[PDB]
Amino acid sequence: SKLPGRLRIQPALWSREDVLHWLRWAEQEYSLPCTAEHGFEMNGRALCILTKDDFRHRAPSSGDELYELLQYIKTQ
Hints:
- Belongs to the ETS family.
- This is Transcription factor ETV7.
- By secondary structure, the protein is mostly helical.
- The protein has helices at 16-30, 44-47, 52-58, 63-74.
- α3 crosses α4 (63-74).
- The longest helix is centred in the first third of the chain and has 15 residues, at 16-30.
């Protein structure tokens, strides 16, 4: 329920591995269908430039809550 320590940095600094870790953490945290781990093959700087519509394109069932989760982490 608490964010993994490696993800406790501004997301623009996340590695590609961190992004994948984040998606797996979010799927567990939100009970999501798990069909999203391989639609964000990019690091955090790339992830942070995607729009909400891009998230919906890449994760049609969960993109909005993933985007909103990322937006919250960007405030931390």
